[PDB]
Amino acid sequence: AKKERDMDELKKEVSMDDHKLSLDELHRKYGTDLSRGLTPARAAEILARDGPNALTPPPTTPEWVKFCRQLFGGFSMLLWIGAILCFLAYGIQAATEEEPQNDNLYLGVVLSAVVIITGCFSYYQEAKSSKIMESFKNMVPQQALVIRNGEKMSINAEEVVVGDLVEVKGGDRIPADLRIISANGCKVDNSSLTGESEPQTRSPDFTNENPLETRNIAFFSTNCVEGTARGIVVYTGDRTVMGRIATLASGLEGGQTPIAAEIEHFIHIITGVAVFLGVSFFILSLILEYTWLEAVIFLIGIIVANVPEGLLATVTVCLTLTAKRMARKNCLVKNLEAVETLGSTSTICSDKTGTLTQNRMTVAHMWSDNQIHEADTTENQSGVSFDKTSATWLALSRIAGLCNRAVFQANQENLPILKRAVAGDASESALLKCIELCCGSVKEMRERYTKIVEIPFNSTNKYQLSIHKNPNTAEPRHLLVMKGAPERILDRCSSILIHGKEQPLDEELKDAFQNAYLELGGLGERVLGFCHLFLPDEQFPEGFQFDTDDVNFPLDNLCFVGLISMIDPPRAAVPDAVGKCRSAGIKVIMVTGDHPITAKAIAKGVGIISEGNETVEDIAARLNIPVSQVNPRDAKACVVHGSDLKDMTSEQLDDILKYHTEIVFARTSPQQKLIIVEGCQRQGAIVAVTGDGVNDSPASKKADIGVAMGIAGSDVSKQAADMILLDDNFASIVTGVEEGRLIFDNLKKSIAYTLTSNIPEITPFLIFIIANIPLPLGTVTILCIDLGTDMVPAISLAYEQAESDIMKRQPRNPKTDKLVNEQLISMAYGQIGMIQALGGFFTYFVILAENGFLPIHLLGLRVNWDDRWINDVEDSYGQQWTYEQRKIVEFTCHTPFFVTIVVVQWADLVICKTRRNSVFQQGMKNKILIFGLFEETALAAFLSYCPGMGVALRMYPLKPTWWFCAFPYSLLIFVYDEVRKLIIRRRPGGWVEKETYY
């Protein structure tokens, strides 16, 4: 129990193992009889010492500390310091808290609830996101078969101590990490470690890449697929290899979601002026020239007139939408903010197998007729067949079909011939399936030609054959067929097909053959040799006795029919969907535990790599590695084997990582995927990781945004990811980077506006001090614009569509190009915020003018204990026009000002609708906005004539003009920025205007 650079940073290493030691040494190390087992007494003696074989979820179950975020949440600080300060107002009262009983106390509880509610949105933005170890610890088996003091007994995996030997049958999960001391035909599936699916085998002895690749170790998560074995627990639970990971890909934390970290840099700037004035006036004004209760009522105002009550709660919605928008196209989202990170994304990291490729051995090509062929390497799509004409294939067809042990399980009615259930193995089922796209059903073809004898698949001696009886009662009555290593097969024939004929083998074709071979091997697909023979009759009469595992019938001078290559093909989309991410300047990289050859050949296959392999020019010229090669780095890309990444330093990676666009590290340990991701991140970037298997877990966390794979993924890989493609359509990454980039913009617009109206809300109280000209705008009135009026329009902005070929610009850097900034503030606080100001300030006067205008008068403290005693401009305003002297601002002015703000907010909510295009040669079809712009303007009126609540609010203004006042202004607005946009344009590079573009 030390620091973190150790408790969760001790995985930058991998090795440290003893399995490359004599059974004697082993036995001695654990002091355990390698066959009688271990003593039960000794058993517990160790469990009560070492501690149960099982994982333990991280200490976490807090459902508050996260809810209670608002206690800093957004602007809830000032709100709290405000609604507490304005909760004091109702206190500092004397002669029976008069009307101030209604006000203050209420504005305190109101601003009070606000904070609370402004939190639920500053909460639903980060739904309880956790539970990895969950699945991991749910991957260990329940029972376990281990040998002790003699017999073999079964018990709870948890009870397996280090040191004893356990037996594992095929189809069970390996109890713990163990070094097999003996086995028989054991084959374990290492998916969850290598990431590859083809079964590996287990030998009691051996050695190799000392720990992970030696055939004498079995791993924690993995499971036995066939055969049997007995080994000795070298590591238990939390201490295993998958334990180290299970722990790592759990206790590790990502951090700040870009978009969500932008919800910071501005929350500060706004909260910067939040006091620069806020307190400034409390001081530079409240100079004992106003009563305490005055300053404070003035304090709690600017507060309210500053924190955009309705805004964060807005972005929340702006997110919620672009989420509930992508989900209709699948690629579900578990964490909102992610949505706008996928757009800020600069680099993508992908698990080749399962993600890019579909992970299913499929026939890639064929060499029937001295000519190459390609097939629908897809998930049933275009390309369509290779031919299917030439009788030659006809033959090859059956071969692959008969010389096969494959089948299907349930009835599988679903036509997904390719998505159906296999039995045998990749190599073979790959073939079976291939012979179902066409040539009817093999099951029937298997019964067409009945099998009488078969020589088991490759038995070290390469090849596999079987003799069936031909029903075509004309030519031979016995057809034997075999396939095996391409080399072997060929070099044991004497004649090969051609459309149907049988020209003899020789030098001529033995060439085009080698070509096809090496020419196919190059693409990195496995190739098999197919051939058959018709055993002559006068040599084998019906009923002839063939001796199974014994020489008896021909083997040489057979007929070579063809070549077939299979591979793990790229998904349908993957091909160009990658290019699209490039179209968008996004860098990619292949992080795979599979082997080099494959990784590269597959990299080239999906654009990940174009022209300029390093180690190739090494041969394509100055036949060497160092020399005029290495240094020159004349190579734009390269393939890095994990074996070497293990011996590299921080900067060493940096170099390799950012000195060329290799896009491919192969054979990598889980940790490595992450250490790789980290390295990408440490260079100030936003990286996303796409995976499927559990080996990704880690990298699917340190990664800014993580993309699982729905079905092609582990019931964990997903638990660690942010996005869950449920159609595995790897193109959604693009239909996600776009939709994300959209909301970045469609948020500024949505935000700029949502606060420009902040100005028209402060100024009143500010002037309200410089020249005691009666509260133009009311506090209880402010909480009714950002949190009541501009609501739907802020939201609306979000729906606003594009503005250009977005996927044409480099990823938005994250250190410079921010969200909120001068460009914005200047153009929304110091420009329009002002013009709006006048407007509603102007209306303030007219609202008094046509009643008792003091364009030169006014400027005076309007007490209320006096009652009548004074007035202005030929009047007697008192108890009658005192209750009333304010009815010109309360029920009025505030109201007309109020409406005027709305009224200016129209042209705002249209000048911010676009960021660079005249609403003219630009869609003005935001159905939502529009029907809201009215749903706003209207509420306004209902809130201005609402027969009752108008008490706790304003009053009946003179419809004919108590509205149009600001109207003269809304225009200038619209007219103003409209020119600049057109200004920004005529002069593209722009000057002061584009310099203060936005």
């Binding site: 159905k927 939502i928 009215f934 209207a938 009126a941 004539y945 009946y956 003179l958």
Partner: peptide, 29 residues
């Protein structure tokens, strides 16, 4: 005001009623 009483609100219902009658009408588009 024997005018904008039961008459200034009907005006507050010409662009609101287009909220659950016309905006709710973008599906039959």
């Amino acid at each position: 005001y024997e005018t904008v009483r039961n008459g200034g609100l009907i005006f507050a219902a010409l662009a609101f009623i287009v909220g659950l009658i016309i905006i709710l009408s973008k599906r039959l588009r």
